[PDB]
Design a protein around this ligand. Structure first.
Ligand code: ZN
Ligand code: ZN
Ligand code: ZN
Lengths: 55, 49, 78, 189, 49, 81, 124, 99, 42, 98
């Protein structure tokens, strides 16, 4: 629910490059910005089976 | 982030830093390298350091 | 007495202009009549040209002493 | 009871206040900052007494306001031990009688300070009084009452600084005494 | 040093960072002190001889 | 899965005491030392300080003691009390 | 914020009342801005203290009368603290002076206490 | 790739763009021609004051699609932002206050 | 100057997927060897 | 009526002092004692172990799980420390020459 107008019409939307969650009835921004891993670490991914990780 | 596949952001390399030092502009490279990259706020205890 | 040069160095000009522009951006009284400009930096430039900027420079010497100069008594040149 | 203290601080003056003379805006700002608060050591502050000296008004980078360091004297409420005060009652409690000083309220009169023959009431919280010859265990102190006379005998500060990572009692306490003759309701004397 | 100022997010000490600015406000240091009536010095004498 | 408690159990317990009348006598002596080394100038306490107001009781309860001085011939001449 | 002295000087209730009266003089001289709660803090504390002192005997005092009073009291050899409570309370019967002065019976005889009573009842 | 060489001494920044370059001898020697597409992405936060109330009002009214217009608005006291695409009304421009 | 304890670095400087970072692997192998030597000496 | 305090506490770095940590002091620093080798829980819920490594009382790295030591999500947690006790003393690489 939008904290400013209480309406439930929140829509996930991204501008040119900015991801954000916007109340589609009053224009308020409730949450903006994301933190994502990049290629530099994408090359290092290993695997551990969960059964192994659980003993 | 780094690439154009992901949305990018160009780099202020180690040589542009020296160019900006050469100009003698002290607030501009502060604005370029802290205000608009990763300005973060922490809290520090002076009793233990 | 005062020993440092009477010319306003380019660094003093840059920082005085920037600080006054920031002061004007925040709601602050403007000394000189403005024709209708809306960019704070241009207003600061006009204030400097008319020599009405209310800033004082404090030139610190490496030994610790200092000299106070008013913006309107430095030799602002090209 | 009032005491004068010396103080030093630094005050920020936002640019839109530049029109007004500094000595007035600075005083207004710091009096805003300090009025009606209690310091941990010296007691409760009322208002600025006077400003004594001003440093230079630096403008720091990344900011438009001017920061100035201030030397000033402030008036603070801090009665000393064995001082005699007069104040209205606020209410009665099993642990004593609470007295209101108009602006300060944390004053307590424990039963030990009260005169001996009266030590408890008839299950009514309104504290009663007893006396040898006259006043045959019928006088009682009103929760509001008049400005009774009393002498302070104890005082303590208690810290309210937050404990533990983030996300009611008064920090200043007083205790009074009424045993001596002439203390309490003026109608008695 | 320049490098520390850069990698700690504070303005450097060369170029536009070598001097300080004051504000030319209309002010009056050490103003007329508020006078006091009761606690004037000459009316207090220690009671101990 | 769980760290051990901060006090693990020990099987060898403190060997019993060894008591005697002379040991009690020594116990006395040490308590007496603890008592008496507080009662001379060599136990230099923090000087009295932080007076509050001109109360009257200082005419009487002020502690009086002589300015202790050792034989100064056996100590350099830079620490006159 | 730092304090340089915690006990620099004492004060008489007359001086505090004068300061609060002056504060009242530059109070309500212009429309209240209601900028923040500090307005209500300051106004409440000043009004409450003024009202409290508005029910005290030290009212209607003036600087000259108090200086003369304390000049006369100089010769009686009391502590400054004593002098301030006498000025602040204006005792009217003997018993409260008996309580106020430390060692009242030992230090002062009856005639001297009577002199103090007359002085306080007459001068103030 | 270590911290000192790679991150502390020189790092990536935003509010910046890259493109090919071409000649245009009809400009002064202190001007650069910027595409309208890149002008619509980069934004400069103007503080509101008595000098430029009406200019910013017009910019806000224009919207985030016609070039001489703005993208976001921040209320003077509450730090929350307001994205002008879902504004539904011009009355934001009327609601602008100093700050 | 001779060590007998180690501070394990916080999570934030070693993200969820490097699955997990190699410092986590080193820490787990160290603690595994510690348990081995403890139980085996006992 | 409430106790006075300073609203603004801004300060500036002046010096950096390098040094070392005693074992007792680095115990004092930590929040928990990591003791177990494994990582995740047996069940398919995949929650990380309690006293093993990856315990979220030492921070978080997921956008949906909050840190338990402080009720803050990934974007706002400063991080926290745990410690591992070593059963036989060992040397330190950088300090070997010393
Ligand atoms: Zn809404
Ligand atoms: Zn600490
Ligand atoms: Zn946390």
């Amino acid at each position: 629910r939008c904290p400013d107008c209480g309406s439930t019409e929140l829509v996930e939307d991204s501008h040119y490059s900015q991801s954000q969650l916007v109340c589609s009835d009053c224009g308020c921004v409730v949450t903006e910005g994301v933190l994502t891993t990049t290629f530099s670490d994408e090359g290092n991914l290993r695997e551990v089976t969960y059964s192994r990780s659980t003993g | 982030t780094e690439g154009r596949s992901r949305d990018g952001g160009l780099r202020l390399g180690e040589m542009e830093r020296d160019c900006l030092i050469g100009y003698g502009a002290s607030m501009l490279l502060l604005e370029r390298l802290m205000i608009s990259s990763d300005a973060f706020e922490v809290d520090v205890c002076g009793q233990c350091g | 007495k005062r020993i440092t040069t009477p010319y306003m160095t380019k660094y003093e000009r840059a920082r005085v202009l920037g600080t006054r522009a920031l002061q004007i951006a925040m709601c602050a009284p403007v000394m000189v009549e403005l024709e209708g400009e809306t960019d704070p930096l241009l207003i600061a430039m006009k204030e400097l040209k008319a020599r009405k900027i209310p800033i004082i420079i404090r030139r610190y010497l490496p030994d610790g002493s200092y000299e106070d100069w008013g913006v309107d008594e430095l030799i602002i040149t090209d | 009871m009032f005491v004068l203290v010396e103080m030093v601080d630094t005050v920020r003056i936002p640019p839109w206040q530049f029109e007004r003379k500094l000595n007035d805006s600075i005083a207004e700002e710091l009096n805003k900052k300090l009025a009606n608060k209690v310091v941990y050591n010296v007691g409760l502050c009322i208002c600025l007494f006077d400003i004594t000296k001003l440093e230079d008004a630096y403008v720091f980078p990344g900011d438009g306001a001017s920061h100035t360091k201030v030397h000033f004297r402030c008036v603070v409420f801090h009665p000393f031990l064995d001082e005699i005060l007069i104040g209205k009652i606020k209410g009665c409690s099993p642990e004593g009688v609470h007295v209101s000083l108009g602006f300060f309220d944390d004053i307590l009169i424990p039963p030990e300070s009260l005169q001996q023959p009266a030590k408890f009431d008839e299950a009514e919280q309104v504290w009663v009084w007893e006396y040898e010859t006259e006043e045959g265990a019928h006088d009682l102190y009103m929760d509001t009452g008049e400005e009774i006379r009393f002498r302070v005998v104890d005082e303590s500060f208690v810290d309210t600084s937050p404990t533990g990572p983030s996300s009611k009692e008064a920090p200043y306490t007083l205790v009074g005494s009424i045993s001596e003759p002439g203390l309490g309701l003026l109608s008695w004397w | 040093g320049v490098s520390e100022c850069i990698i700690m997010g504070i303005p450097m000490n060369i170029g536009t960072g070598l001097f300080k600015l004051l504000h030319k406000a209309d002010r009056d240091p050490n103003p007329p002190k508020r006078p006091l009536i009761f606690d004037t010095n000459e009316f207090h004498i220690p009671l101990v001889t | 899965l769980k760290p051990p408690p901060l006090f693990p159990d020990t099987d060898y317990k403190p060997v019993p005491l060894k008591t005697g009348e002379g040991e009690e006598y020594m116990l006395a002596l040490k308590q007496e030392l603890r008592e008496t080394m507080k009662r001379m100038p060599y136990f230099i306490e923090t000087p009295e300080e932080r007076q509050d107001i001109e109360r009257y009781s200082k005419r009487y309860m002020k502690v009086y003691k002589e300015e202790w001085i050792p034989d100064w011939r056996r100590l350099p001449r830079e620490m006159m009390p | 914020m730092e304090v340089k002295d915690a006990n620099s000087a004492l004060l008489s209730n007359y001086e505090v009342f004068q300061l609060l009266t002056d504060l009242k003089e530059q109070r309500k001289e212009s429309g209240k801005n209601k900028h923040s709660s500090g307005q209500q803090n300051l106004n409440t504390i000043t009004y409450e203290t003024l009202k409290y002192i508005s029910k005290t005997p030290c009212r209607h005092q003036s600087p000259e009368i108090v200086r003369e009073f304390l000049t006369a009291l100089k010769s009686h050899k009391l502590t400054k603290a004593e002098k301030l409570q006498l000025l602040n309370h204006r005792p009217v019967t003997a018993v409260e002076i008996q309580l106020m002065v430390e060692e009242s019976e030992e230090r002062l005889t009856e005639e001297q206490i009577e002199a103090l009573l007359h002085t306080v009842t007459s001068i103030l | 790739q270590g911290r000192f060489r790679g991150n502390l001494s020189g790092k990536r920044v935003d509010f910046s763009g890259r493109t090919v370059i071409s000649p245009d001898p009809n400009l002064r020697i202190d001007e650069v021609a910027v595409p309208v597409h890149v002008a619509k992405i980069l934004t400069f936060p103007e503080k509101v004051n008595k000098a430029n109330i009406n200019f910013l009002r017009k910019l806000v009214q224009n919207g985030p699609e016609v070039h001489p217009g703005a993208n976001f608005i921040q209320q003077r006291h509450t730090q929350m932002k307001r994205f002008l695409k879902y504004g539904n009304r011009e009355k934001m421009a009327q609601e602008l206050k100093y700050g | 100057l001779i060590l007998t304890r180690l501070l394990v670095p916080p999570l934030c400087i070693r993200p969820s997927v490097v699955n997990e970072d190699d410092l986590t692997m080193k820490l787990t192998e160290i603690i595994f060897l510690n348990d081995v030597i403890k139980k085996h000496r006992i | 009526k409430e106790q006075f305090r300073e609203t603004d506490v801004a300060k500036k770095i002046s010096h950096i002092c390098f040094g070392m940590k005693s074992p007792e002091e680095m115990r004092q620093q930590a929040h928990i004692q990591v003791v177990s080798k494994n990582l995740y829980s047996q069940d398919n819920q995949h929650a990380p172990l309690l006293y093993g490594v990856l315990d979220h009382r030492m921070g978080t790295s997921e956008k949906d799980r909050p840190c338990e030591t402080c009720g803050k999500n990934l974007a706002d947690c400063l991080g926290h420390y745990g410690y591992i006790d070593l059963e036989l003393p060992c040397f330190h690489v950088g300090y070997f020459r010393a």
